[PDB]
Amino acid sequence: SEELEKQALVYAVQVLLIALRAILQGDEKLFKLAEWAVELAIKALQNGDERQVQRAILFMQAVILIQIVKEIAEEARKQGDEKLFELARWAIELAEKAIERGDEESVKRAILFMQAVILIQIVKKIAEKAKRQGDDKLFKLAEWAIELAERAIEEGDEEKVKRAILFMEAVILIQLVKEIAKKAKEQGDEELFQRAEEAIKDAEKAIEEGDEEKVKEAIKKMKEVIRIQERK
Amino acid sequence: SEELEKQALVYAVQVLLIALRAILQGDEKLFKLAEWAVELAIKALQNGDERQVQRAILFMQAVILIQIVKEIAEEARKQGDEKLFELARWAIELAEKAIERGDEESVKRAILFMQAVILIQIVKKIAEKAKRQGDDKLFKLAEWAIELAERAIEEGDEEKVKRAILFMEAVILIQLVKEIAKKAKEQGDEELFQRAEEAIKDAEKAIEEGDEEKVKEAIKKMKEVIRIQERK
Amino acid sequence: SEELEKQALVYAVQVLLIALRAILQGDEKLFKLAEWAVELAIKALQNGDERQVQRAILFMQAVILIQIVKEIAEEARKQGDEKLFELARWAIELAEKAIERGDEESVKRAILFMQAVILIQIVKKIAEKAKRQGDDKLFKLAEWAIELAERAIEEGDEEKVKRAILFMEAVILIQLVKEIAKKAKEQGDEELFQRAEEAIKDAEKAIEEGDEEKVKEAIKKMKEVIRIQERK
């Protein structure tokens, strides 16, 4: 499909902006990695080859993710999160190594680690906003999810980081569905408030059992409540 | 459509060259604006939305226009046109702010100002082309179009400035309709020398008439003289 | 959905990487050449013209080839090869001139010369490979191809150079078909062992330099041995 090559071109220009940032921040590793990924994308494009674009898109994704987690690591070092700094710094070095190595599935591994680190940055902000609002039950959930995802990165288990991304994702969506339930009380619309309340509890209780399976069901039923707010 | 996304990619690569020129011509404000517009374009493409890609194309147009008017402002600064320098500088700063603000309606305003300034640079050159050539009288008309577009910014009238672009555009059209008009000795440009003269005379009086109903018609009928030359 | 404009878009990003390198090595000549080619490509694409893209694709190829032959000249300065350095330096200068003007007839000329210079870098390595492992043929052949390709470039001859590349390529393909015959002893196969040996001599015996007709045939019969292994 003429769609895989369009992202190969779009991600190439996207990584090119990162290469300009590497030109103006003094970094040579980031510039060379960015050039490497964009060059691989071009070499994939020039033959009308489909598997080479999947590989080069994975490399461009890893370069963009390195750029994101590098600034997130700087943000964590600035804001006094020395542990999140080391976890991001670790995932950054592992991604850089995997790209220098050329191991396609190890980049997939490192890309997953960077996704969890970014999700930890998000759940931390949601947890701190939840404590700002005085909630100690979503706070317990969000804190239990970050403290379970970081422990998983401390071990480097690829299938335990995937499990922790599941919980973190549901905790992020509980925020949305809880705001929607709060606003579904203002119009008088109870067909949106019941649906949101059912998705909140069935996701919170899913994390209460901590079952890898019941969070997936909660995610789809949470999706069928966010879907309704996305209609209007 | 697909043609809109290829235009977004072409303008993206086009603005990136401008960002490359910013490193070697000394401007860093231009680099940030270029990075901003290209980032919005890339992420606009990555979601396939029709208004936001049109929006990012409008912003990339504004960044390119800033680059053009910046070279025009320096050229006016060099050639002792401090008045054209300040109007270009004003349209440049308003464009930068309109993008910095994110107000699309302010970007359209500033983009309109930048094109009008660019048209002022051109209509001045047709007057200078008259200095290169002999004298066809007129000349005050081109000056009347240049100095009325300049006055147009002093009021910022919404039902104006486009009118001044209209006059400047027709004065720019004097260039084409007369270049072909020169070729008419014994062969007499296919004998349709009258049609160029009919477009010349009925436009000369039209710009003096200050009309906005039929001067557009005169502009299109000058193009129907260019149309036949566009075949050969 | 046509495809040549996608080739122009890929080459644009490819030349942009070279333009990033020109920004950081102090070289502005390459930046101007890169800017010229990419701008010509961008403005050709934005109106859907096909002939202008064929031109711009030819020019972007010349800018990339300039980047390749410039680093080859840099490599030649280190290893003390004044002959390859000056031939590369000449092939670069004519391309730079041809791009600066926009002359299509000189770009084709300069691209061909850059093709021969790069092929001389390759045949040099194949000649040294034959000398290392005690070869009584290839050793003389590869050296004779180098000494005749340099002969054509030393003159700036557009016509006589269009002949030495044939031998250089055939000497390069003898390497491949000899590797295939050597591996056709290792695999246990019989359809790649007889015919690869059949293709080797048909190129080796084609030592007839005044042949100028069957060197293409030897290339095609080597293509009829190498290409089939490219399936699996």
XYZ file of C-alpha atoms in Angstrom:
696
model
C 0.000 0.000 0.000
C 1.144 3.545 -0.829
C 0.597 4.294 2.880
C 3.674 2.637 4.413
C 5.985 4.766 2.264
C 4.090 7.956 3.165
C 4.879 7.472 6.857
C 8.448 6.571 5.886
C 8.679 10.018 4.295
C 6.763 11.789 7.090
C 8.855 10.214 9.847
C 11.977 11.076 7.837
C 11.168 14.795 7.845
C 10.131 14.456 11.491
C 13.512 12.953 12.376
C 15.157 15.685 10.275
C 13.864 18.301 12.721
C 15.494 16.274 15.502
C 18.710 16.294 13.464
C 18.526 20.094 13.315
C 18.071 20.128 17.093
C 21.165 17.923 17.367
C 23.006 20.436 15.170
C 22.167 23.272 17.577
C 22.518 21.460 20.930
C 26.033 20.100 20.354
C 25.094 16.409 20.218
C 26.834 14.171 17.673
C 25.313 10.821 18.675
C 21.773 12.113 18.105
C 22.677 13.705 14.768
C 24.388 10.546 13.495
C 21.561 8.279 14.697
C 18.983 10.588 13.103
C 20.913 10.649 9.822
C 21.259 6.855 9.988
C 17.510 6.319 10.403
C 16.594 8.809 7.664
C 19.205 7.313 5.332
C 17.790 3.824 5.924
C 14.293 5.168 5.191
C 15.502 6.675 1.911
C 17.233 3.426 0.924
C 14.004 1.577 1.729
C 11.958 4.017 -0.354
C 14.237 3.957 -3.417
C 13.447 0.309 -4.237
C 9.705 0.182 -3.616
C 10.493 -2.436 -0.977
C 8.005 -3.030 1.826
C 9.981 -4.867 4.551
C 12.813 -2.336 4.454
C 10.332 0.447 5.280
C 9.039 -1.467 8.323
C 12.651 -1.684 9.531
C 13.480 1.960 8.774
C 10.193 3.183 10.287
C 11.146 1.300 13.457
C 14.527 3.054 13.433
C 12.990 6.498 12.902
C 10.499 5.755 15.691
C 13.407 4.871 17.979
C 15.264 8.081 17.098
C 12.181 10.191 17.809
C 11.599 8.273 21.040
C 15.226 8.851 22.054
C 14.713 12.583 21.505
C 11.541 12.499 23.618
C 12.987 10.456 26.485
C 16.171 12.569 26.491
C 14.169 15.728 27.186
C 11.979 13.788 29.638
C 15.149 12.659 31.428
C 16.305 16.287 31.576
C 12.874 17.239 32.926
C 13.121 14.535 35.596
C 16.658 15.532 36.596
C 15.533 19.172 36.795
C 12.365 18.527 38.841
C 14.245 16.377 41.374
C 13.289 12.908 40.101
C 16.731 11.310 40.140
C 15.309 7.789 39.815
C 13.163 8.607 36.782
C 16.283 10.270 35.382
C 18.250 7.024 35.700
C 15.411 4.912 34.293
C 15.013 7.220 31.285
C 18.799 7.449 30.893
C 18.916 3.637 30.970
C 16.196 3.227 28.339
C 17.972 5.881 26.261
C 21.303 4.065 26.335
C 19.632 0.725 25.580
C 17.824 2.220 22.579
C 21.003 3.879 21.299
C 22.863 0.576 21.691
C 20.142 -1.399 19.883
C 20.223 1.007 16.917
C 24.020 0.953 16.736
C 23.770 -2.850 16.900
C 21.166 -3.121 14.147
C 19.078 -5.732 15.996
C 15.534 -5.057 14.773
C 13.656 -6.876 17.537
C 15.921 -5.448 20.246
C 14.904 -1.998 19.008
C 11.296 -3.152 19.426
C 12.293 -4.094 22.973
C 13.904 -0.712 23.645
C 10.989 1.118 21.985
C 8.635 -0.595 24.437
C 10.831 0.527 27.354
C 10.660 4.147 26.162
C 6.866 3.919 25.871
C 6.628 2.845 29.523
C 8.994 5.603 30.677
C 6.869 8.195 28.879
C 3.757 6.650 30.423
C 5.426 6.899 33.843
C 5.945 10.619 33.222
C 2.218 10.873 32.469
C 0.872 8.791 35.368
C 3.132 10.748 37.730
C 1.501 13.998 36.603
C -1.969 12.452 36.842
C -1.161 11.108 40.312
C 0.095 14.512 41.481
C -2.984 16.214 40.033
C -5.129 13.595 41.791
C -3.418 14.310 45.120
C -3.913 18.011 44.357
C -7.656 17.264 44.230
C -7.308 15.203 47.422
C -8.172 11.817 45.913
C -6.358 8.947 47.645
C -7.957 6.058 45.726
C -6.857 6.934 42.198
C -3.677 8.180 43.864
C -3.263 4.667 45.257
C -3.870 3.237 41.778
C -1.627 5.637 39.848
C 1.133 5.359 42.458
C 0.857 1.565 42.447
C 1.110 1.582 38.632
C 4.221 3.786 38.426
C 5.883 1.947 41.324
C 5.136 -1.295 39.449
C 6.348 -0.031 36.060
C 9.592 1.377 37.474
C 10.304 -1.892 39.294
C 9.765 -3.642 35.955
C 12.343 -1.386 34.296
C 14.659 -2.071 37.242
C 14.490 -5.716 36.089
C 14.275 -5.082 32.329
C 11.526 -7.651 31.729
C 9.954 -6.965 28.340
C 6.705 -8.759 29.205
C 6.432 -7.068 32.619
C 6.860 -3.612 31.138
C 4.072 -4.555 28.730
C 1.925 -5.567 31.708
C 2.740 -2.301 33.482
C 1.882 -0.303 30.343
C -1.557 -1.954 30.494
C -2.239 -0.687 34.028
C -0.739 2.756 33.343
C -2.932 3.080 30.239
C -6.095 2.219 32.188
C -5.126 4.658 34.952
C -4.698 7.380 32.319
C -8.122 6.607 30.840
C -9.796 6.553 34.276
C -8.845 10.236 34.491
C -10.752 10.961 31.275
C -13.780 8.823 32.143
C -13.911 10.362 35.628
C -13.927 13.885 34.204
C -16.629 12.769 31.761
C -18.695 11.327 34.614
C -18.268 14.614 36.495
C -19.488 16.640 33.496
C -22.277 14.147 32.762
C -23.865 15.410 36.000
C -24.166 18.981 34.662
C -26.449 18.470 31.651
C -28.698 15.988 33.422
C -27.665 13.231 30.981
C -27.573 10.012 33.002
C -27.067 7.726 30.006
C -23.543 9.180 29.773
C -22.998 9.257 33.553
C -23.997 5.628 34.141
C -21.834 4.516 31.205
C -18.877 6.485 32.573
C -19.461 5.261 36.139
C -19.586 1.658 34.915
C -16.278 2.127 33.071
C -14.638 3.819 36.067
C -15.563 1.082 38.544
C -14.927 -1.826 36.156
C -11.461 -0.370 35.496
C -10.672 0.546 39.105
C -11.901 -2.851 40.317
C -9.869 -4.468 37.526
C -6.716 -2.885 38.954
C -8.019 -3.940 42.382
C -7.850 -7.564 41.244
C -4.753 -6.652 39.196
C -5.714 -9.083 36.435
C -3.955 -8.755 33.064
C -7.316 -9.741 31.488
C -9.874 -7.467 33.182
C -8.011 -4.276 32.284
C -8.438 -5.075 28.576
C -12.200 -5.410 29.038
C -12.224 -2.155 31.010
C -10.219 -0.457 28.243
C -12.842 -1.290 25.605
C -15.750 -0.251 27.826
C -13.853 2.927 28.677
C -13.354 3.367 24.937
C -17.122 3.118 24.421
C -17.608 6.048 26.834
C -14.850 8.280 25.419
C -16.204 7.451 21.962
C -19.509 9.072 22.972
C -17.830 12.265 24.179
C -15.783 12.315 20.961
C -19.042 12.354 18.949
C -20.132 15.776 20.237
C -7.335 14.874 -0.466
C -4.048 13.260 -1.507
C -3.038 16.390 -3.423
C -3.307 18.374 -0.176
C -0.916 16.039 1.677
C 1.671 16.085 -1.122
C 1.511 19.880 -1.005
C 2.045 19.671 2.762
C 5.119 17.487 2.203
C 6.509 19.742 -0.539
C 6.071 22.881 1.569
C 7.582 21.010 4.525
C 10.757 20.220 2.582
C 10.656 23.793 1.265
C 10.529 25.353 4.744
C 13.302 23.025 5.932
C 15.651 24.555 3.364
C 14.700 27.934 4.821
C 15.568 26.520 8.235
C 18.880 25.367 6.750
C 19.470 28.861 5.341
C 18.760 30.328 8.788
C 21.907 28.655 10.165
C 24.047 30.222 7.413
C 22.398 33.657 7.064
C 22.390 34.390 10.816
C 18.670 34.305 11.641
C 17.603 32.120 14.560
C 14.048 33.461 14.896
C 13.415 32.058 11.413
C 14.693 28.632 12.486
C 12.213 28.418 15.371
C 9.344 29.571 13.149
C 10.374 27.033 10.503
C 10.615 24.272 13.111
C 7.211 25.282 14.491
C 5.480 25.252 11.095
C 7.096 22.002 9.933
C 6.320 20.263 13.229
C 2.671 21.317 12.974
C 2.589 20.105 9.361
C 4.142 16.716 10.161
C 1.784 16.080 13.074
C -1.099 17.431 10.975
C -0.341 14.803 8.334
C -0.014 12.083 10.977
C -3.703 12.547 11.895
C -5.157 13.007 8.383
C -7.333 16.039 9.180
C -8.378 18.471 6.466
C -8.586 21.805 8.313
C -5.397 21.410 10.366
C -3.324 20.463 7.307
C -4.751 23.481 5.491
C -3.819 25.378 8.656
C -0.244 24.077 8.710
C 0.072 24.817 4.989
C -1.074 28.362 5.751
C 1.605 28.605 8.445
C 4.300 27.221 6.144
C 3.183 29.787 3.571
C 3.597 32.495 6.221
C 7.108 31.325 7.130
C 8.181 31.297 3.470
C 6.614 34.735 2.979
C 8.511 35.988 6.030
C 11.727 34.761 4.401
C 10.835 36.527 1.147
C 9.865 39.813 2.790
C 12.989 39.597 4.971
C 15.163 39.584 1.853
C 13.011 42.374 0.417
C 13.354 44.392 3.639
C 17.152 44.089 3.560
C 17.155 45.050 -0.138
C 15.116 48.159 0.698
C 17.468 48.833 3.607
C 20.399 48.595 1.172
C 18.904 50.617 -1.704
C 17.893 53.480 0.579
C 14.167 52.707 0.770
C 13.622 53.105 4.509
C 9.876 53.437 3.923
C 9.610 50.092 2.128
C 12.021 48.775 4.773
C 9.716 49.750 7.653
C 6.544 48.454 5.974
C 8.242 45.133 5.207
C 9.597 45.056 8.768
C 6.063 45.733 10.038
C 4.443 43.004 7.918
C 7.244 40.643 8.977
C 6.798 41.323 12.688
C 3.006 41.002 12.429
C 3.384 37.667 10.630
C 5.810 36.408 13.276
C 3.392 37.459 16.030
C 0.327 36.112 14.203
C 2.069 32.730 14.049
C 3.447 33.170 17.580
C -0.097 33.934 18.743
C -1.562 31.124 16.648
C -4.363 33.367 15.423
C -5.066 32.051 11.941
C -7.195 35.099 11.147
C -4.222 37.278 12.116
C -1.950 35.143 9.924
C -4.225 35.662 6.896
C -4.095 39.396 7.681
C -0.297 39.452 7.929
C 0.060 37.168 4.899
C -2.103 39.633 2.987
C 0.215 42.422 4.163
C 3.364 40.530 3.143
C 2.119 39.816 -0.388
C 1.066 43.453 -0.791
C 4.543 44.533 0.321
C 6.044 42.083 -2.177
C 3.770 43.538 -4.852
C 5.053 47.001 -3.879
C 8.620 45.806 -4.482
C 7.508 44.648 -7.939
C 5.453 47.679 -9.025
C 8.405 49.871 -8.050
C 10.481 47.801 -10.484
C 7.938 48.296 -13.298
C 8.431 52.020 -12.679
C 12.176 51.337 -12.799
C 11.517 49.246 -15.921
C 9.933 52.397 -17.332
C 13.204 54.136 -16.463
C 15.000 51.333 -18.322
C 12.586 51.736 -21.268
C 11.243 54.972 -22.776
C 8.153 56.774 -21.471
C 4.540 55.643 -22.024
C 3.265 58.512 -19.809
C 1.177 56.976 -16.985
C 3.798 56.206 -14.281
C 1.703 58.212 -11.808
C -0.745 55.287 -11.939
C 1.905 52.805 -10.797
C 2.938 55.378 -8.192
C -0.747 55.795 -7.339
C -0.958 52.024 -6.810
C 2.283 51.801 -4.804
C 1.618 54.740 -2.479
C -2.043 53.739 -2.009
C -1.090 50.239 -0.916
C 1.370 51.909 1.462
C -1.418 54.142 2.814
C -3.608 51.027 3.023
C -1.677 49.791 6.068
C -2.166 53.152 7.820
C -5.893 52.358 8.048
C -5.964 48.548 8.077
C -9.415 48.585 6.479
C -10.907 45.121 6.001
C -12.823 46.212 2.866
C -9.500 47.490 1.457
C -5.854 46.403 0.911
C -7.240 43.725 -1.395
C -8.378 46.632 -3.561
C -4.810 47.954 -3.480
C -3.511 44.491 -4.396
C -5.976 44.631 -7.299
C -4.460 47.875 -8.623
C -0.886 46.652 -8.090
C -1.768 43.385 -9.838
C -3.154 45.209 -12.870
C -0.098 47.485 -12.920
C 2.039 44.342 -12.845
C -0.072 43.038 -15.742
C 1.041 46.097 -17.747
C 4.390 44.296 -17.988
C 3.015 41.253 -19.835
C 0.391 42.876 -22.073
C 2.925 45.437 -23.332
C 5.823 42.999 -23.888
C 3.652 41.033 -26.320
C 2.254 44.314 -27.698
C 5.772 45.338 -28.782
C 5.877 42.393 -31.220
C 3.533 43.764 -33.904
C 5.306 45.200 -36.969
C 4.392 43.886 -40.426
C 3.265 40.498 -39.142
C 1.169 42.269 -36.481
C 0.991 39.702 -33.634
C -1.616 37.548 -35.460
C -3.646 40.825 -35.937
C -4.896 40.640 -32.337
C -2.909 43.740 -31.415
C -6.214 45.495 -30.769
C -7.104 42.915 -28.097
C -3.967 43.794 -26.133
C -4.710 47.497 -26.721
C -8.340 46.939 -25.686
C -7.043 45.360 -22.490
C -4.504 48.176 -22.008
C -6.792 51.178 -22.542
C -9.848 49.800 -20.720
C -7.572 48.912 -17.785
C -5.757 52.263 -17.663
C -9.073 54.082 -17.234
C -10.359 51.303 -14.950
C -7.571 51.724 -12.384
C -8.263 55.460 -12.458
C -11.971 54.698 -11.984
C -11.161 52.805 -8.790
C -13.795 50.170 -9.521
C -14.086 46.813 -7.751
C -16.865 45.360 -9.961
C -15.387 45.415 -13.469
C -11.652 45.981 -12.896
C -11.480 42.296 -11.973
C -13.057 41.707 -15.386
C -10.357 43.873 -16.986
C -7.680 41.809 -15.211
C -9.147 38.553 -16.545
C -9.439 39.943 -20.086
C -5.774 40.961 -19.979
C -5.146 37.289 -19.169
C -7.196 36.326 -22.251
C -4.473 38.152 -24.190
C -1.787 36.231 -22.315
C -3.855 33.076 -22.917
C -3.144 33.059 -26.659
C 0.560 33.647 -26.067
C 0.432 30.849 -23.472
C -0.277 28.462 -26.367
C 2.886 29.455 -28.237
C -1.164 7.566 -8.529
C 2.044 8.245 -10.473
C 5.515 7.697 -8.977
C 8.280 9.924 -10.455
C 7.287 12.805 -8.166
C 7.743 10.455 -5.210
C 11.250 9.812 -6.534
C 11.791 13.582 -6.596
C 10.559 13.811 -2.995
C 12.889 11.044 -1.786
C 15.880 12.595 -3.566
C 15.019 15.954 -1.972
C 15.341 14.574 1.566
C 18.438 12.671 0.428
C 20.096 15.878 -0.767
C 18.903 17.586 2.436
C 21.086 15.252 4.511
C 24.021 16.341 2.345
C 22.925 19.943 2.919
C 23.021 19.303 6.670
C 26.600 18.089 6.239
C 27.480 21.182 4.178
C 26.237 23.448 6.982
C 28.627 21.853 9.487
C 31.844 21.487 7.457
C 32.108 25.134 6.432
C 31.360 24.348 2.789
C 28.848 26.681 1.146
C 29.451 25.550 -2.445
C 27.704 22.241 -1.719
C 24.915 24.034 0.163
C 24.200 26.308 -2.803
C 24.244 23.335 -5.189
C 21.994 21.346 -2.847
C 19.676 24.333 -2.383
C 19.538 24.865 -6.157
C 18.645 21.246 -6.948
C 16.091 20.789 -4.158
C 14.422 24.138 -4.877
C 14.195 23.246 -8.567
C 12.630 19.921 -7.570
C 10.179 21.504 -5.115
C 8.964 24.162 -7.549
C 8.695 21.546 -10.314
C 6.528 19.317 -8.097
C 4.165 22.037 -6.840
C 2.522 22.430 -10.280
C 2.436 18.757 -11.314
C 4.905 19.053 -14.184
C 6.637 15.848 -15.267
C 9.388 17.114 -17.578
C 10.742 19.504 -14.933
C 10.969 16.606 -12.456
C 13.058 14.565 -14.901
C 15.372 17.580 -15.003
C 15.350 18.086 -11.230
C 15.905 14.369 -10.595
C 18.927 14.575 -12.912
C 20.239 17.597 -10.975
C 19.686 16.094 -7.513
C 21.569 12.998 -8.684
C 24.477 15.267 -9.676
C 24.541 16.938 -6.244
C 24.592 13.559 -4.473
C 27.325 12.350 -6.827
C 29.288 15.498 -5.991
C 28.998 14.618 -2.297
C 30.212 11.076 -3.045
C 33.193 12.073 -5.216
C 34.212 14.855 -2.789
C 34.684 12.355 0.053
C 36.485 10.023 -2.367
C 38.842 12.911 -3.129
C 39.237 13.443 0.621
C 40.089 9.746 0.941
C 42.610 10.098 -1.907
C 44.435 12.988 -0.196
C 45.105 10.773 2.825
C 46.494 7.755 0.945
C 48.791 9.842 -1.278
C 47.034 9.162 -4.606
C 47.469 12.396 -6.555
C 46.133 10.817 -9.766
C 42.706 9.799 -8.427
C 42.525 13.053 -6.443
C 42.911 15.278 -9.512
C 40.549 13.189 -11.660
C 37.911 13.341 -8.922
C 38.614 17.065 -8.468
C 38.008 17.649 -12.180
C 34.806 15.586 -12.300
C 33.488 17.539 -9.304
C 34.331 20.962 -10.773
C 32.502 20.333 -14.068
C 29.409 19.100 -12.208
C 29.500 22.145 -9.923
C 29.725 24.397 -12.986
C 26.981 22.507 -14.826
C 24.686 22.760 -11.797
C 25.500 26.442 -11.209
C 24.423 27.237 -14.782
C 21.631 24.665 -15.048
C 23.108 23.154 -18.237
C 21.477 19.764 -18.792
C 24.028 18.756 -21.449
C 27.006 19.290 -19.112
C 25.349 17.565 -16.124
C 24.888 14.354 -18.123
C 28.552 14.686 -19.090
C 29.726 15.294 -15.517
C 27.513 12.544 -14.058
C 29.098 10.042 -16.450
C 32.593 11.177 -15.428
C 31.679 10.817 -11.750
C 30.374 7.326 -12.524
C 33.757 6.394 -14.015
C 35.699 7.869 -11.076
C 33.659 5.882 -8.544
C 34.081 2.742 -10.654
C 37.850 3.342 -10.661
C 37.748 3.322 -6.854
C 35.994 -0.063 -7.062
C 38.163 -1.692 -9.749
C 41.230 -0.569 -7.781
C 40.017 -2.699 -4.869
C 39.254 -5.629 -7.190
C 42.689 -5.267 -8.804
C 44.312 -5.385 -5.363
C 42.166 -8.409 -4.447
C 43.469 -10.271 -7.507
C 47.055 -9.325 -6.623
C 46.701 -10.443 -2.984
C 45.525 -14.012 -3.703
C 47.913 -14.676 -6.611
C 45.696 -14.290 -9.680
C 47.211 -14.669 -13.151
C 44.303 -13.103 -15.071
C 42.026 -10.633 -13.213
C 45.295 -9.082 -12.031
C 46.159 -8.041 -15.597
C 42.504 -7.412 -16.511
C 41.550 -5.072 -13.653
C 44.783 -3.097 -14.069
C 44.098 -2.745 -17.801
C 40.587 -1.462 -17.054
C 41.967 1.137 -14.644
C 44.665 2.243 -17.093
C 42.088 2.773 -19.873
C 39.389 4.448 -17.766
C 41.950 6.919 -16.426
C 43.069 7.465 -20.028
C 39.579 8.691 -20.927
C 39.154 10.911 -17.853
C 42.634 12.442 -18.270
C 41.291 13.960 -21.515
C 37.811 14.998 -20.403
C 36.616 12.933 -23.353
C 32.865 12.370 -23.250
C 32.956 9.733 -26.016
C 35.966 7.527 -25.230
C 34.969 7.304 -21.552
C 31.679 5.749 -22.724
C 33.627 2.498 -23.266
C 36.017 1.896 -20.356
C 33.135 1.651 -17.858
C 32.014 -1.434 -19.810
C 35.278 -3.261 -19.082
C 35.383 -1.957 -15.500
C 31.878 -3.304 -14.894
C 32.641 -6.624 -16.590
C 35.779 -6.958 -14.460
C 33.588 -6.216 -11.433
C 31.084 -8.862 -12.548
C 33.836 -11.473 -13.027
C 34.366 -11.078 -9.273
C 30.705 -11.924 -8.627
C 30.439 -14.893 -11.014
C 33.750 -16.234 -9.656
C 32.416 -15.949 -6.107
C 29.262 -17.732 -7.282
C 31.260 -20.538 -8.917
C 33.408 -20.832 -5.781
C 30.256 -21.034 -3.660
C 28.685 -23.371 -6.240
C 31.327 -25.877 -5.113
C 30.307 -25.367 -1.459
C 26.499 -25.567 -1.736
C 26.363 -28.880 -3.581
C 24.350 -27.348 -6.444
C 24.741 -28.170 -10.138
C 22.644 -25.528 -11.899
C 24.771 -22.727 -10.429
C 28.116 -24.507 -10.929
C 28.224 -25.384 -14.642
C 26.595 -22.173 -15.892
C 28.538 -19.813 -13.608
C 31.754 -21.316 -14.986
C 30.192 -20.933 -18.443
C 29.659 -17.202 -17.802
C 33.110 -16.599 -16.268
C 35.166 -17.438 -19.355
C 32.661 -15.728 -21.663
C 33.698 -12.561 -19.817
C 37.340 -13.549 -19.232
C 37.870 -14.741 -22.807
C 36.238 -11.466 -23.895
C 39.699 -9.946 -23.305
C 39.314 -8.739 -26.899
C 39.404 -5.001 -26.193
C 38.513 -4.172 -29.792
C 35.279 -6.078 -29.279
C 33.035 -3.117 -28.289
C 29.942 -5.298 -28.892
C 30.133 -8.571 -26.932
C 31.192 -6.966 -23.641
C 27.499 -6.141 -23.272
C 26.784 -9.794 -24.117
C 29.274 -10.997 -21.496
C 27.605 -8.622 -19.027
C 24.185 -10.063 -19.898
C 25.351 -13.676 -19.574
C 26.850 -12.778 -16.206
C 23.504 -11.124 -15.443
C 21.821 -14.400 -16.397
C 23.892 -16.142 -13.703
C 23.906 -13.541 -10.905
C 20.265 -12.402 -11.158
C 18.807 -15.888 -10.606
C 20.508 -16.204 -7.200
C 18.885 -12.875 -6.232
C 15.591 -14.809 -6.054
C 16.751 -16.944 -3.093
